[PDB]
Structures are given as C-alpha cells and as structure tokens.
C-alpha cells in the first residue's frame, strides 16, 4: 500500500452548515451536439475530415 | 560455475533464467565515470549460532545481496579487515560477521557487467533496434503496433490527431501517417 502523507491530527471537524435551497437554482445548460458538447474522442483510432 | 567468495557471498545469477557475464574495462576516452580507492570483496559471510560454537555460512541468493552488506562498508578499508555485529534474540540470537578483501585499483578501471534475460509469452517488447526497422523503407513493407499492412510511406500534411497515432478513413483501413518521430509518413494501399 501506498503512503498518502500524515493521518490528520485535529480532534474535531469543521461543522457543515447543510442548506440546499440556497443551492437550487435554474441555470440551464443542456447538451447541444450540434456545437459537440460531451463528446469522447474514439478511443481505437482517430481521424481527419 | 564457481563456488568461490564471489557466488558464495558477493553476487549470483539465476540459473533458471539464461544469463551473460561481461568483463571489460574503461578506456580514459571516457571520463564520467570514475574509479574507487580500490577493488573491494567479502570473504566471509557467516553466522555464530547462539551456542558460540556453531559457524553457518550465509550464502546469498540470485537477485539479492549478501545479509553482510550491512556491517562491510561500501569500499573496503584494508585487505583482511573483519566485521561483527551482535544479534537480537529475535534476529535469532549470536552474532554475525563478515571479512573483507582487496585488489589494488588499476590504471584504466575494470568493470562487470551481469545481464539477465526473460523470454516472455506475448510480452516479448525488450527487442533491439536497427536502420531498415525505420526510415526510409519508402515502399512495402511496415508494421507497426498491434497492426500489420503493405504501405507506400510518404511525407505527408498534416491532418489527424496527433496524440494517439493512426489515422482512419472511414473504413478499416489506415491512410496512415503515425508512426514516426515525429512527422507524417502518410501510407497507400499496395
Ligand atoms: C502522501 C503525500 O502526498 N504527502 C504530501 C507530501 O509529499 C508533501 O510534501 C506535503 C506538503 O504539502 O503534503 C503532503
Ligand atoms: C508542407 C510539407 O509537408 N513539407 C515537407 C517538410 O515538412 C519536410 O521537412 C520535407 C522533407 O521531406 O518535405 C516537405
């Protein structure tokens, strides 16, 4: 196994404040492929025009 | 096959595996490397079993080091010098010790060279190098990677990837370029 550094030494953790509605918001950005959103390259080969 | 300090105690091959031994010695046209005090060897490696009578010689293994490269320095001090170190009941109680040798160093250093081959099933890609392997083969035939083919190369632009190596044309083919260091030896069908 791989060593990743020090345990942290803090006996405590930071305290999360849970709020979700602050977070939904409508900022839409669908897909377009046309402009070739989201697209892998081919992994087996590749290709010109 | 030789049962002297050097396979006892030094350096040993594996016997299951095929194996070379070169001898050779650096001119002075090369000068990176440079030369020790002197030529350093153990003589003896061996245990004293906790009874203070009983002597078993630690003999070392193919791919390994002597247990004494621990107590014998990198280079030997002096011809004969000896070296002990106690041991913990854990490590199995008594002591161990180890004697060193010397050669006097010589003009031009003198080296060697152990090498070690596998033969692989499917695996096999430590291969030598050459020129026809490469450039300019500019005609029949390649073969490249994973893939085969009779292939006409020319210096071609410049489309493609870049990144990975072969260029498509719609179909199975490959029309071509990629792979060279870096340019495009764009291929034809036969
Ligand atoms: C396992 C690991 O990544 N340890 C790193 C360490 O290498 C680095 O020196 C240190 C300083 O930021 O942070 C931690
Ligand atoms: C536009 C083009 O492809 N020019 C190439 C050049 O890159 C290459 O160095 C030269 C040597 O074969 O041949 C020509």
Partial sequence: ?49 | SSAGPISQFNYKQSFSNPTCLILATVPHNLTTITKPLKYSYINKCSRLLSDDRTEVPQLVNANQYSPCVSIVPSTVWEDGDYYRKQLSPLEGGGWLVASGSTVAMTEQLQMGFGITVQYGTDTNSVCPKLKIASQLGNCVEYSLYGVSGRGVFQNCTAVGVRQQRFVYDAYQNLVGYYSDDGNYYCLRAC
């Fill in chain 1, 1 to 49: 196994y791989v060593d990743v550094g020090p345990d942290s030494v803090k006996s405590a953790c930071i305290e999360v404040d849970i709020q979700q509605t602050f977070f939904d918001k409508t900022w839409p950005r669908p897909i377009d492929v046309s402009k070739a959103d989201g697209i892998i390259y081919p992994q087996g080969r590749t290709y010109s025009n």
